[PDB]
Amino acid sequence: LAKDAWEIPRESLRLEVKLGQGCFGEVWMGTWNGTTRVAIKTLKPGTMSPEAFLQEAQVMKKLRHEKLVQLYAVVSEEPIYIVIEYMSKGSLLDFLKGEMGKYLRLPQLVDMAAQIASGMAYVERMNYVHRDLRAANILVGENLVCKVADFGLARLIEDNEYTARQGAKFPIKWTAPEAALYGRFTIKSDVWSFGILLTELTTKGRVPYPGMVNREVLDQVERGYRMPCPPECPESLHDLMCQCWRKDPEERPTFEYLQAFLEDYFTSTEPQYQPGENL
Ligand SMILES: Nc1ncnc2c1ncn2[C@@H]1O[C@H](COP(=O)(O)OP(=O)(O)OP(O)(O)=S)[C@@H](O)[C@H]1O
Ligand SMILES: [Mg+2]
Secondary structure, three states: OOOOOOEOOHHHEEEEEEEEEEOOEEEEEEEEOOOEEEEEEEOOOOOOOHHHHHHHHHHHHHOOOOOEOOEEEEEOOOOOEEEEEOOOOEEHHHHHHOHHHHHOOHHHHHHHHHHHHHHHHHHHHOOEEOOOOOHHHEEEOHHHOEEEOOOOOOEEOOOOOEEOOOOOOOOHHHOOHHHHHHOEEOHHHHHHHHHHHHHHHHOOOOOOOOOOOHHHHHHHHHOOOOOOOOOOOOHHHHHHHHHHOOOOHHHOOOHHHHHHHHHOHHHHHOOOOOOOOOO
Protein backbone atom coordinates (compact mmCIF):
# COMPACT_ATOMS: atom_id res chain seq x y z
CA LEU A 1 0.00 0.00 0.00
CA ALA A 2 2.77 2.43 0.98
CA LYS A 3 4.55 4.32 -1.82
CA ASP A 4 8.14 5.56 -2.07
CA ALA A 5 10.34 7.41 -4.58
CA TRP A 6 10.25 4.60 -7.16
CA GLU A 7 6.75 5.70 -8.10
CA ILE A 8 6.20 7.34 -11.49
CA PRO A 9 3.12 8.69 -13.30
CA ARG A 10 1.61 6.16 -15.71
CA GLU A 11 1.36 8.97 -18.25
CA SER A 12 5.16 8.93 -18.49
CA LEU A 13 5.03 5.47 -20.12
CA ARG A 14 3.99 4.31 -23.56
CA LEU A 15 3.49 0.60 -24.21
CA GLU A 16 4.41 -0.09 -27.83
CA VAL A 17 5.00 -3.80 -28.49
CA LYS A 18 3.92 -6.96 -26.70
CA LEU A 19 6.93 -9.18 -25.92
CA GLY A 20 5.17 -11.86 -23.91
CA GLN A 21 2.14 -13.01 -21.96
CA GLY A 22 1.58 -15.31 -18.99
CA CYS A 23 -1.07 -16.30 -16.46
CA PHE A 24 -0.28 -13.25 -14.30
CA GLY A 25 0.09 -10.51 -16.92
CA GLU A 26 2.11 -9.28 -19.88
CA VAL A 27 5.53 -7.90 -20.78
CA TRP A 28 5.74 -4.97 -23.18
CA MET A 29 8.51 -3.03 -24.82
CA GLY A 30 7.90 0.70 -24.49
CA THR A 31 9.21 4.21 -24.04
CA TRP A 32 9.69 5.94 -20.71
CA ASN A 33 9.75 9.73 -20.46
CA GLY A 34 9.44 9.76 -24.26
CA THR A 35 13.17 9.05 -24.47
CA THR A 36 14.14 5.74 -22.83
CA ARG A 37 13.48 2.24 -24.12
CA VAL A 38 12.17 -0.05 -21.40
CA ALA A 39 10.44 -3.31 -20.64
CA ILE A 40 7.18 -3.14 -18.73
CA LYS A 41 5.67 -6.05 -16.78
CA THR A 42 1.93 -5.71 -16.22
CA LEU A 43 -0.35 -7.32 -13.65
CA LYS A 44 -3.49 -8.97 -15.00
CA PRO A 45 -6.42 -7.84 -12.79
CA GLY A 46 -7.58 -10.44 -10.27
CA THR A 47 -4.94 -13.09 -10.88
CA MET A 48 -2.39 -12.18 -8.24
CA SER A 49 -2.43 -9.82 -5.26
CA PRO A 50 -1.00 -6.37 -6.04
CA GLU A 51 1.25 -6.83 -2.99
CA ALA A 52 2.43 -10.23 -4.21
CA PHE A 53 3.14 -8.93 -7.70
CA LEU A 54 5.20 -6.02 -6.37
CA GLN A 55 7.37 -8.16 -4.08
CA GLU A 56 9.42 -8.67 -7.23
CA ALA A 57 9.94 -4.91 -7.55
CA GLN A 58 10.84 -4.79 -3.84
CA VAL A 59 13.61 -7.34 -4.31
CA MET A 60 14.99 -5.44 -7.32
CA LYS A 61 15.04 -2.20 -5.30
CA LYS A 62 17.66 -3.93 -3.14
CA LEU A 63 19.68 -5.98 -5.64
CA ARG A 64 21.62 -3.70 -8.01
CA HIS A 65 24.39 -5.13 -10.17
CA GLU A 66 25.54 -5.00 -13.80
CA LYS A 67 24.58 -8.66 -14.28
CA LEU A 68 21.05 -8.46 -12.85
CA VAL A 69 18.17 -6.97 -14.82
CA GLN A 70 17.79 -3.44 -13.44
CA LEU A 71 14.59 -1.98 -11.99
CA TYR A 72 13.71 1.52 -13.21
CA ALA A 73 10.35 2.44 -11.69
CA VAL A 74 6.94 1.32 -10.47
CA VAL A 75 3.32 2.29 -10.99
CA SER A 76 1.63 1.14 -7.76
CA GLU A 77 -1.92 1.90 -8.86
CA GLU A 78 -4.09 -0.50 -10.87
CA PRO A 79 -3.10 -1.44 -13.48
CA ILE A 80 0.24 -2.20 -11.77
CA TYR A 81 3.42 -1.70 -13.83
CA ILE A 82 6.98 -2.73 -13.13
CA VAL A 83 9.37 -0.81 -15.38
CA ILE A 84 12.71 -2.49 -16.04
CA GLU A 85 15.86 -2.57 -18.17
CA TYR A 86 15.12 -3.71 -21.74
CA MET A 87 17.02 -6.81 -22.89
CA SER A 88 16.99 -6.78 -26.70
CA LYS A 89 17.74 -10.46 -27.35
CA GLY A 90 15.12 -11.87 -25.01
CA SER A 91 15.36 -15.15 -23.15
CA LEU A 92 18.66 -17.06 -23.06
CA LEU A 93 16.71 -20.29 -23.57
CA ASP A 94 15.13 -19.08 -26.81
CA PHE A 95 18.42 -17.48 -27.88
CA LEU A 96 20.23 -20.81 -27.46
CA LYS A 97 17.67 -22.76 -29.46
CA GLY A 98 17.35 -20.24 -32.29
CA GLU A 99 19.69 -19.64 -35.24
CA MET A 100 22.18 -17.59 -33.20
CA GLY A 101 22.74 -20.48 -30.79
CA LYS A 102 24.05 -22.65 -33.62
CA TYR A 103 27.00 -20.28 -34.13
CA LEU A 104 28.04 -20.13 -30.48
CA ARG A 105 31.03 -22.16 -29.30
CA LEU A 106 32.40 -23.03 -25.87
CA PRO A 107 34.39 -19.86 -25.19
CA GLN A 108 31.29 -17.75 -25.70
CA LEU A 109 29.01 -20.07 -23.71
CA VAL A 110 31.54 -20.14 -20.87
CA ASP A 111 31.71 -16.33 -20.84
CA MET A 112 27.92 -16.22 -20.64
CA ALA A 113 28.06 -18.67 -17.74
CA ALA A 114 30.68 -16.49 -16.08
CA GLN A 115 28.49 -13.39 -16.33
CA ILE A 116 25.59 -15.30 -14.80
CA ALA A 117 27.91 -16.57 -12.08
CA SER A 118 28.97 -12.94 -11.49
CA GLY A 119 25.37 -11.86 -11.01
CA MET A 120 24.71 -14.82 -8.71
CA ALA A 121 27.88 -14.16 -6.67
CA TYR A 122 26.38 -10.73 -6.02
CA VAL A 123 23.10 -12.38 -4.98
CA GLU A 124 25.26 -14.61 -2.81
CA ARG A 125 27.04 -11.64 -1.14
CA MET A 126 23.71 -9.92 -0.48
CA ASN A 127 22.36 -12.95 1.40
CA TYR A 128 19.49 -13.59 -1.01
CA VAL A 129 18.35 -16.77 -2.76
CA HIS A 130 16.82 -16.59 -6.24
CA ARG A 131 14.97 -19.94 -6.38
CA ASP A 132 14.11 -19.73 -10.11
CA LEU A 133 17.55 -19.77 -11.71
CA ARG A 134 17.51 -21.36 -15.19
CA ALA A 135 18.08 -20.43 -18.84
CA ALA A 136 14.46 -19.31 -19.27
CA ASN A 137 15.08 -16.75 -16.52
CA ILE A 138 18.26 -15.30 -17.99
CA LEU A 139 17.93 -12.41 -20.44
CA VAL A 140 20.32 -11.58 -23.28
CA GLY A 141 21.29 -8.11 -24.47
CA GLU A 142 23.65 -6.84 -27.12
CA ASN A 143 27.05 -8.49 -27.60
CA LEU A 144 26.18 -11.60 -25.58
CA VAL A 145 25.54 -9.72 -22.34
CA CYS A 146 23.59 -12.02 -19.98
CA LYS A 147 21.74 -10.93 -16.86
CA VAL A 148 19.71 -12.85 -14.30
CA ALA A 149 16.04 -11.88 -14.33
CA ASP A 150 12.65 -12.69 -12.82
CA PHE A 151 13.09 -12.07 -9.10
CA GLY A 152 9.50 -12.93 -8.17
CA LEU A 153 10.56 -15.81 -5.93
CA ALA A 154 13.75 -14.23 -4.59
CA ARG A 155 13.95 -13.83 -0.81
CA LEU A 156 16.31 -12.39 1.79
CA ILE A 157 17.70 -15.27 3.84
CA GLU A 158 17.22 -15.25 7.60
CA ASP A 159 18.57 -18.10 9.73
CA ASN A 160 20.66 -19.59 6.92
CA GLU A 161 17.56 -20.91 5.13
CA TYR A 162 14.34 -19.77 3.47
CA THR A 163 11.77 -22.46 4.32
CA ALA A 164 9.04 -22.71 1.69
CA ARG A 165 5.38 -22.41 2.74
CA GLN A 166 3.03 -25.37 2.61
CA GLY A 167 1.55 -25.90 -0.84
CA ALA A 168 4.41 -24.24 -2.70
CA LYS A 169 5.46 -26.29 -5.74
CA PHE A 170 8.75 -26.06 -7.67
CA PRO A 171 10.00 -27.56 -10.98
CA ILE A 172 11.79 -30.74 -9.99
CA LYS A 173 14.31 -30.94 -12.86
CA TRP A 174 15.68 -27.42 -12.24
CA THR A 175 15.49 -27.37 -8.42
CA ALA A 176 17.82 -28.90 -5.80
CA PRO A 177 16.39 -32.08 -4.16
CA GLU A 178 16.42 -30.68 -0.62
CA ALA A 179 14.49 -27.61 -1.81
CA ALA A 180 11.95 -29.49 -3.93
CA LEU A 181 11.31 -32.15 -1.28
CA TYR A 182 11.71 -30.42 2.08
CA GLY A 183 11.44 -26.75 1.07
CA ARG A 184 14.99 -25.92 2.16
CA PHE A 185 16.08 -22.97 0.01
CA THR A 186 19.64 -21.63 0.38
CA ILE A 187 22.24 -20.07 -1.92
CA LYS A 188 23.45 -23.66 -2.29
CA SER A 189 20.18 -24.77 -3.87
CA ASP A 190 20.78 -21.94 -6.35
CA VAL A 191 24.23 -23.43 -6.99
CA TRP A 192 22.54 -26.74 -7.84
CA SER A 193 20.29 -24.84 -10.28
CA PHE A 194 23.35 -23.17 -11.78
CA GLY A 195 24.72 -26.64 -12.52
CA ILE A 196 21.53 -27.47 -14.41
CA LEU A 197 21.92 -24.15 -16.26
CA LEU A 198 25.41 -25.23 -17.39
CA THR A 199 23.80 -28.25 -19.08
CA GLU A 200 21.31 -25.90 -20.79
CA LEU A 201 24.23 -23.80 -22.11
CA THR A 202 26.29 -26.76 -23.35
CA THR A 203 23.32 -28.50 -25.01
CA LYS A 204 22.12 -25.17 -26.40
CA GLY A 205 18.72 -25.37 -24.76
CA ARG A 206 17.96 -29.06 -24.29
CA VAL A 207 15.72 -30.08 -21.40
CA PRO A 208 17.59 -31.53 -18.39
CA TYR A 209 17.11 -35.25 -17.67
CA PRO A 210 15.84 -35.78 -21.25
CA GLY A 211 13.23 -38.54 -21.51
CA MET A 212 12.88 -38.94 -17.72
CA VAL A 213 9.74 -37.98 -15.81
CA ASN A 214 9.62 -35.97 -12.60
CA ARG A 215 9.21 -38.88 -10.16
CA GLU A 216 11.97 -40.81 -11.91
CA VAL A 217 14.36 -37.85 -11.64
CA LEU A 218 13.57 -37.51 -7.95
CA ASP A 219 14.12 -41.26 -7.46
CA GLN A 220 17.28 -41.72 -9.56
CA VAL A 221 18.96 -38.54 -8.26
CA GLU A 222 18.53 -39.73 -4.66
CA ARG A 223 20.14 -43.01 -5.76
CA GLY A 224 23.10 -40.98 -7.03
CA TYR A 225 22.24 -40.55 -10.69
CA ARG A 226 23.63 -37.41 -12.33
CA MET A 227 23.40 -36.19 -15.93
CA PRO A 228 26.39 -37.46 -17.97
CA CYS A 229 28.86 -35.22 -19.82
CA PRO A 230 27.05 -33.54 -22.74
CA PRO A 231 28.34 -34.24 -26.29
CA GLU A 232 31.48 -32.25 -27.17
CA CYS A 233 31.61 -30.78 -23.67
CA PRO A 234 34.98 -31.08 -21.92
CA GLU A 235 34.90 -33.38 -18.89
CA SER A 236 36.32 -30.60 -16.70
CA LEU A 237 33.14 -28.54 -17.17
CA HIS A 238 30.92 -31.56 -16.45
CA ASP A 239 33.07 -32.11 -13.36
CA LEU A 240 32.06 -28.57 -12.40
CA MET A 241 28.36 -29.46 -12.87
CA CYS A 242 28.82 -32.53 -10.67
CA GLN A 243 30.31 -30.31 -7.95
CA CYS A 244 27.19 -28.13 -8.16
CA TRP A 245 25.15 -31.33 -7.76
CA ARG A 246 26.70 -32.71 -4.58
CA LYS A 247 24.08 -34.24 -2.26
CA ASP A 248 25.34 -32.27 0.72
CA PRO A 249 24.55 -28.61 -0.06
CA GLU A 250 27.45 -27.25 2.00
CA GLU A 251 29.90 -29.21 -0.18
CA ARG A 252 28.63 -27.37 -3.26
CA PRO A 253 30.88 -24.54 -4.49
CA THR A 254 30.25 -20.85 -3.84
CA PHE A 255 29.27 -18.60 -6.74
CA GLU A 256 32.42 -16.65 -5.94
CA TYR A 257 34.39 -19.77 -6.86
CA LEU A 258 32.20 -20.59 -9.87
CA GLN A 259 32.69 -17.10 -11.35
CA ALA A 260 36.48 -17.26 -10.98
CA PHE A 261 36.66 -20.83 -12.35
CA LEU A 262 34.71 -19.90 -15.48
CA GLU A 263 36.53 -16.58 -16.01
CA ASP A 264 39.89 -18.38 -16.01
CA TYR A 265 38.66 -21.60 -17.66
CA PHE A 266 40.67 -21.49 -20.87
CA THR A 267 43.92 -20.56 -19.14
CA SER A 268 43.81 -22.58 -15.91
CA THR A 269 41.67 -25.56 -16.88
CA GLU A 270 41.61 -26.10 -20.65
CA PRO A 271 44.69 -24.33 -22.10
CA GLN A 272 44.75 -26.57 -25.19
CA TYR A 273 41.04 -26.47 -26.09
CA GLN A 274 39.97 -26.27 -29.73
CA PRO A 275 36.44 -25.67 -31.11
CA GLY A 276 34.57 -28.64 -32.56
CA GLU A 277 31.43 -28.85 -34.70
CA ASN A 278 29.14 -27.51 -31.97
CA LEU A 279 31.21 -26.51 -28.92
N1 LIG B 1 13.47 -6.99 -19.42
C1 LIG B 1 13.06 -7.66 -20.51
N2 LIG B 1 13.62 -7.31 -21.72
C2 LIG B 1 13.20 -8.02 -22.81
N3 LIG B 1 12.30 -9.03 -22.92
C3 LIG B 1 11.76 -9.35 -21.70
C4 LIG B 1 12.10 -8.71 -20.47
N4 LIG B 1 11.38 -9.27 -19.41
C5 LIG B 1 10.63 -10.22 -19.98
N5 LIG B 1 10.81 -10.33 -21.39
C6 LIG B 1 10.14 -11.27 -22.32
O1 LIG B 1 9.04 -11.90 -21.66
C7 LIG B 1 9.38 -13.22 -21.21
C8 LIG B 1 8.88 -13.49 -19.74
O2 LIG B 1 9.83 -13.04 -18.77
P1 LIG B 1 9.62 -13.26 -17.18
O3 LIG B 1 9.97 -12.16 -16.27
O4 LIG B 1 10.33 -14.63 -16.85
O5 LIG B 1 8.10 -13.52 -16.65
P2 LIG B 1 7.32 -14.45 -15.67
O6 LIG B 1 7.80 -15.88 -16.06
O7 LIG B 1 5.87 -14.27 -15.45
O8 LIG B 1 7.75 -14.54 -14.10
P3 LIG B 1 7.29 -15.36 -12.84
O9 LIG B 1 7.21 -14.40 -11.57
O10 LIG B 1 8.18 -16.47 -12.49
S1 LIG B 1 5.32 -15.79 -12.97
C9 LIG B 1 10.94 -13.17 -21.28
O11 LIG B 1 11.42 -14.47 -21.21
C10 LIG B 1 11.17 -12.42 -22.62
O12 LIG B 1 10.70 -13.17 -23.68
MG1 LIG C 1 10.00 -17.05 -15.84
